[PDB]
Design a protein around this nucleic acid. Structure first.
Ligand SMILES: [K+]
Ligand SMILES: [Mg+2]
Ligand SMILES: [Mg+2]
Ligand SMILES: [Mg+2]
Ligand SMILES: [Mg+2]
Ligand SMILES: [Mg+2]
Ligand SMILES: [Mg+2]
Ligand SMILES: [Mg+2]
Ligand SMILES: [Mg+2]
Ligand SMILES: [Mg+2]
Ligand SMILES: [Mg+2]
Ligand SMILES: [Mg+2]
Ligand SMILES: [Mg+2]
Ligand SMILES: [Mg+2]
Ligand SMILES: [Mg+2]
Ligand SMILES: [Mg+2]
Ligand SMILES: [Mg+2]
Ligand SMILES: [Mg+2]
Ligand SMILES: [Mg+2]
Ligand SMILES: [Mg+2]
Ligand SMILES: [Mg+2]
Ligand SMILES: [Mg+2]
Ligand SMILES: [Mg+2]
Ligand SMILES: [Mg+2]
Ligand SMILES: [Mg+2]
Ligand SMILES: [Mg+2]
Ligand SMILES: [Mg+2]
Ligand SMILES: [Mg+2]
Ligand SMILES: [Mg+2]
Ligand SMILES: [Mg+2]
Ligand SMILES: [Mg+2]
Ligand SMILES: [Mg+2]
Ligand SMILES: [Mg+2]
Ligand SMILES: [Mg+2]
Ligand SMILES: [Mg+2]
Ligand SMILES: [Mg+2]
Ligand SMILES: [Mg+2]
Ligand SMILES: [Mg+2]
Ligand SMILES: [Mg+2]
Ligand SMILES: [Mg+2]
Ligand SMILES: [Mg+2]
Ligand SMILES: [Mg+2]
Ligand SMILES: [Mg+2]
Ligand SMILES: [Mg+2]
Ligand SMILES: [Mg+2]
Ligand SMILES: [Mg+2]
Ligand SMILES: [Mg+2]
Ligand SMILES: [Mg+2]
Ligand SMILES: [Mg+2]
Ligand SMILES: [Mg+2]
Ligand SMILES: [Mg+2]
Ligand SMILES: [Mg+2]
Ligand SMILES: [Mg+2]
Ligand SMILES: [Mg+2]
Ligand SMILES: [Mg+2]
Ligand SMILES: [Mg+2]
Ligand SMILES: [Mg+2]
Ligand SMILES: [Mg+2]
Ligand SMILES: [Mg+2]
Ligand SMILES: [Mg+2]
Ligand SMILES: [Zn+2]
Lengths: 84, 101, 119, 50, 71
RNA sequence: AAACUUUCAACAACGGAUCUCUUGGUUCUCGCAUCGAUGAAGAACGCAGCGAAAUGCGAUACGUAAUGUGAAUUGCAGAAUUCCGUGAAUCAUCGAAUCUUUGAACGCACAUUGCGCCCCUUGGUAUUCCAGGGGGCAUGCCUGUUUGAGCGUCAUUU
RNA sequence: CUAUCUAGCGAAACCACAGCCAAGGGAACGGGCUUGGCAGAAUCAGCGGGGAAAGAAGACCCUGUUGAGCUUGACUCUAGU
RNA sequence: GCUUGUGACGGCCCGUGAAAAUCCACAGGAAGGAAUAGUUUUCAUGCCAGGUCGUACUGAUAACCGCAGCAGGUCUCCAAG
RNA sequence: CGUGGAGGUCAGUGACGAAGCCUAGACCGUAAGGUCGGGUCGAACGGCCUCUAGUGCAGAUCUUGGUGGUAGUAGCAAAUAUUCAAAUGAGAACUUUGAAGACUGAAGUGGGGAAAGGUUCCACGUCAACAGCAGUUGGACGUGGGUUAGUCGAUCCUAAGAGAUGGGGAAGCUCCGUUUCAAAGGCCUGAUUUUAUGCAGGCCACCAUCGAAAGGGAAUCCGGUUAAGAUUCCGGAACCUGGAUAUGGAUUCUUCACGGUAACGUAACUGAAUGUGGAGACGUCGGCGCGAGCCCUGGGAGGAGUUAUCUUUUCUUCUUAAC
RNA sequence: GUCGAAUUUGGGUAUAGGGGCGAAAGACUAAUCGAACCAUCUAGUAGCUGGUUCCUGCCGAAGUUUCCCUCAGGAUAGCAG
RNA sequence: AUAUUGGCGAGAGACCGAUAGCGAACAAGUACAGUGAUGGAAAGAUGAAAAGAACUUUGAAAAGAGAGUGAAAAAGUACGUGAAAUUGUUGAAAGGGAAGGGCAUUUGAUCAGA
């Protein structure tokens, strides 16, 4: 055993989907995401994991608000309207 | 170079006591005014087996002196104690088997 | 070619609500038709008309609340200006221009003088 | 499992909806580097891993 | 679904995934002016929601479908 | 002698080298200072007449409003050509909005699209039950408000 | 049932170049070198002499101022007490 | 007779073989209670509502894991002569 | 000598063909190399003087990619086994139908499920790739269709355990601990109805929450129906929970029922706090009793098979849910 | 071999790397165990093995001395340009 | 005044030129592997313009042969050029247990110079 016959017994998931990152790294019994650290308030990341930081850092999503912050700054955070 | 078995026992992972079937901690009544000054009479309702304990336990029901209700206590049954026997606990209790003095 | 926001802005909120209901009925009819008809693109115009009507309705409601809260402090937070969080937390111009009495006295007495070297 | 969580069923629904070949009118667009659906998945080849 | 409309007096609707059976019943009643005997719902494998709305015997689902534009 | 083997050439294969390309990288320099409880970064799921993605967006869903430009978009279909016009566009700009489910993530939970409580309102006789709509209910801390606790303690009636 | 022959299908190990010997000498056991024996296309099934056949930078042994597991009044420390 | 449910028993233990939600009953006697009338939704009948998510199929010598349509592995119910 | 790039120069070469590549064609150099012709090709490139380097490959069990001989070779041999005909089709050992021969032999090669998968289910079209032969077939490819619940599950409960809070520790990420050294409370209602609430009569607490699709647990069955769903749809027939309710019944002039010696009976037959009790709720094995379903079997009422002979015969239908 | 109890087994749960777990084999801890896996420190160090890419011309060795925790290394003198 | 391998906006280079340069010039932190932490590719070029081959014919069909487009199909989306290994055909030659090499000449083929 310990090879092919043992691989036949693999039908119980150690991890499921994480609510925070969606990676299937949420350890069911530990109730902790091995990837993002949920439910810890901080997002898990390590300076030895530079590639993982790059995978999950700012700019890898769509930046729904941060993408417009810069244009708003350039216009000086104006508040009125263009006023034809 | 390895942590030996008696060392591993202290972490209490697989060396904890199997307490599922146990009847509860066998204890005398809380030492109160009635036992400190006179006595209180309880009744032996059941003499039961405790898992993991050789001695049988006696469930003894006393009246609550301050509230209308019954308080069940788990004594360790002394030999000769029987169900339906009246147990007397306190300073003024008699020198009879099963009494708490 | 759909509704125009400048046209909708001349209508009362009841007229806008009625037009919104009519546009929703029209969209429902159009998507019923879509199941049979192959590739009708008229649905997009009605969807954008619904969006325009909703935008104008919200503009009117928000302007009404702005008028209600005009002048008084503590307006609703979605009507307050959205600078950055740090910018909202920064000292106002009044603060950070506050000076102590001693400082004001000495800066009035000895301001930076204007001078030139002339030789 | 036939008794699945709604989250699982939502993921399977998305996978089913995206299990399709490339639309044929793409490959007619002006520049169109896209040749085929390179992200096509099949139940017999690559598992979703939830 | 059209067979259900013809034979079972049941209208088949795609409905909001957030809508429950009460909401489906009251929305069908308001939109189409019909009495609803029963609402059964399921979530299709494509992730949308399908409602089988059995109208009461007072109304004819084929007639309602003809009115609302799909025969 | 053929076949076969080997060598060379031509043509054809195999393969993708070379050459020439280059909306990419790399390094240097210059300038600027702007994320988030007013909900960020990130995630999930959705949204187009015909899209699986990338990109965009959020049930107002490849977008609404506003401003500028001034006639497109384009793979097809459709629409329009009044297009001498508050007006095309997958345009630019962008100050008004929307912004599903989440996420520091905030009613409680979450391997559940699970379970409450409060207010306003609508329907079912309906303050109590059920349902729909709208608005709410986290924690630490600060200032203040109100209601309180303690023979901690003052005065006063006594 | 294979092996075998056929239709279809169709890998791998391995491969400096290759493949007949005897003796000689030679890194002291040659497929090649020297001297002889010889030597005729293209091949099939078997076979286990040889290819000091393949498999793996010998695990034995030694060397390294290379480790590691383990032990002990080795040297130097240390949790605890 | 087989399978299965169940009953009353009997053997065994230095083993005596879950918990909680929940439901009922009893003790008690607070309170509320009748005469051109009071009492009772634990009796009968009658009225209304019951949301959300799952639900297809395989479950294995081809739908799972083992690089695969792999002689391996992977829990269980029914069970004819 | 040769290579990438740089300053200068030849007002160098070039779509009338740069570079590259191929060429048992020619020339120069001892050589590194250089030059020319021919073919191919399509957009750049070279001589000289200098500058500069990521500048020259046969090896490194080198790296990446590509390709051989081996070699049409090893082999495609476990799970008893196939055959005839027709249809379809360009094409049939392998598809479909029929016939025949076999097997699993109910601890199945049958009928369902749990985990897992995720559309593989089903239909239509369809064969380039995949099914180590084939293929008209397919778990493939393309396009669509399909999963209907008050009663089945989840949801709720707690189990081993997990884990906030109050606190304590830790520089800190965080750790401990789960009722603890905490002012940890909602629900009844006198009274209030300046408002059934605050003031105000009075009753109960040694504590979040998560943790079981096999434990606990409110309640649904039968018949029929689809290409594919069924305890979910349809038809009929029930039941539970929550709520609202009005009759009838019952009860009362001895106000809160009567009967039976009793065990107890009933259509009902007031009952707050508080307390107590029960159910939930429990091991295993052995024989014995009973039930259900199945098996076996008699008569009869049908249908089928064998019938040279024999066989009142062989096979088969004769059923009854929850409530 | 064993097959009714130190039995077999699903699911839930706990124990995590000098740690666990071990009816004890240094066994097992996801084909990994006399210290798992992943990333980083890290292009770790190597007196040791392998390789180290154009031509021609001229000159042209040493394996010896002394010292070294030196004996597969170096310094030093010698030989060479 | 100083720092700045992050962010935003710019200007550059004796830098690299698709096995190089960031891992990623492209739907690249993608596909895919792993329970997981993590690991992590390959992959640019028809042509000025699709003008992306009407039509005929053989074939069940894929396709072929023509025709046609185009400057070119010796550019046919298996697309610029199109090397080598390796391969087919054709032609030439040689061949008693390898082949290849050096010097020299014969023979065949081929060729420059004058
Ligand atoms: K070791
Ligand atoms: Mg192992
Ligand atoms: Mg586990
Ligand atoms: Mg314990
Ligand atoms: Mg349902
Ligand atoms: Mg938001
Ligand atoms: Mg010999
Ligand atoms: Mg010899
Ligand atoms: Mg040899
Ligand atoms: Mg010889
Ligand atoms: Mg021979
Ligand atoms: Mg042999
Ligand atoms: Mg041999
Ligand atoms: Mg060695
Ligand atoms: Mg070795
Ligand atoms: Mg040494
Ligand atoms: Mg050591
Ligand atoms: Mg049984
Ligand atoms: Mg089913
Ligand atoms: Mg099934
Ligand atoms: Mg089965
Ligand atoms: Mg598989
Ligand atoms: Mg360079
Ligand atoms: Mg040329
Ligand atoms: Mg050549
Ligand atoms: Mg060109
Ligand atoms: Mg180099
Ligand atoms: Mg090489
Ligand atoms: Mg070399
Ligand atoms: Mg090699
Ligand atoms: Mg290789
Ligand atoms: Mg063979
Ligand atoms: Mg074999
Ligand atoms: Mg066989
Ligand atoms: Mg057949
Ligand atoms: Mg048999
Ligand atoms: Mg048989
Ligand atoms: Mg099928
Ligand atoms: Mg095949
Ligand atoms: Mg085939
Ligand atoms: Mg056919
Ligand atoms: Mg299919
Ligand atoms: Mg149930
Ligand atoms: Mg804790
Ligand atoms: Mg729970
Ligand atoms: Mg259960
Ligand atoms: Mg079915
Ligand atoms: Mg029904
Ligand atoms: Mg009576
Ligand atoms: Mg040993
Ligand atoms: Mg190095
Ligand atoms: Mg010399
Ligand atoms: Mg050596
Ligand atoms: Mg690259
Ligand atoms: Mg290249
Ligand atoms: Mg692993
Ligand atoms: Mg190319
Ligand atoms: Mg050309
Ligand atoms: Mg080419
Ligand atoms: Mg070649
Ligand atoms: Zn996560």
């Amino acid at each position: 055993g310990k090879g092919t016959p043992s691989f036949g017994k693999r039908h119980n998931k150690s991890h499921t989907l994480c609510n925070r990152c969606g990676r299937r790294s949420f350890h069911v019994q530990k109730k902790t995401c091995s990837s993002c650290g949920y439910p810890a308030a901080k997002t898990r990341s390590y300076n030895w994991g530079a590639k993982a930081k790059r995978r999950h850092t700012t700019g890898t999503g769509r930046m729904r608000y941060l993408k417009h912050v810069s244009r708003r700054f350039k216009n000086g955070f104006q508040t009125g309207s263009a006023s034809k | 170079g390895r942590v030996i078995r008696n060392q591993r026992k202290g972490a209490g992972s697989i060396f904890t006591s199997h307490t599922r079937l146990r009847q509860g901690a066998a204890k005398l009544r809380t030492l109160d005014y009635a036992e400190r000054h006179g006595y209180i009479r309880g009744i032996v309702k059941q003499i039961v087996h405790d898992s993991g304990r050789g001695a049988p336990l006696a469930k003894v029901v006393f009246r609550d002196p301050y509230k209308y209700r019954l308080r069940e206590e788990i004594f360790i049954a002394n030999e000769g104690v029987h169900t339906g026997q009246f147990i007397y606990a306190g300073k003024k209790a008699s020198l009879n088997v099963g009494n708490v003095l | 070619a759909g509704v125009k926001a400048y046209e909708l802005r001349t209508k009362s909120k009841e007229q806008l609500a009625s037009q919104l209901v009519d546009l929703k009925k029209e969209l429902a009819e159009l998507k019923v038709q879509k199941l049979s008809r192959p590739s009708l693109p008229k649905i997009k115009t009605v969807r954008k008309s619904i969006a325009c009507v909703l935008t104008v309705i919200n503009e009117q409601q928000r302007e009404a609340v702005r008028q209600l809260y005009k002048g008084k402090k503590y307006q609703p937070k979605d009507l307050r200006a959205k600078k950055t969080r740090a910018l909202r937390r920064a000292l106002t111009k009044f603060e950070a221009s506050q000076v102590t009495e001693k400082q004001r006295k000495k800066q009035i007495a000895f301001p930076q003088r204007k001078y030139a070297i002339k030789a | 499992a036939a008794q699945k969580s709604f989250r699982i069923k939502q993921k399977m629904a998305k996978a089913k909806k995206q299990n399709r070949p490339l639309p044929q009118w793409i490959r007619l667009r002006t520049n169109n580097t896209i040749r085929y659906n390179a992200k096509r998945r099949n139940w017999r080849r690559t598992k979703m891993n939830i | 679904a059209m067979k259900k409309v013809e034979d079972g007096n049941i209208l088949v609707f795609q409905v909001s995934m957030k809508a429950n059976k009460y909401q489906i019943k009251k929305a069908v009643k308001e939109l189409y002016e019909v009495d609803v005997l029963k609402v059964n719902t399921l979530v299709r494998p494509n992730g949308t929601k399908k409602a089988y709305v059995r109208l009461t015997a007072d109304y004819d689902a084929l007639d309602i479908a003809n009115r609302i534009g799909y025969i």
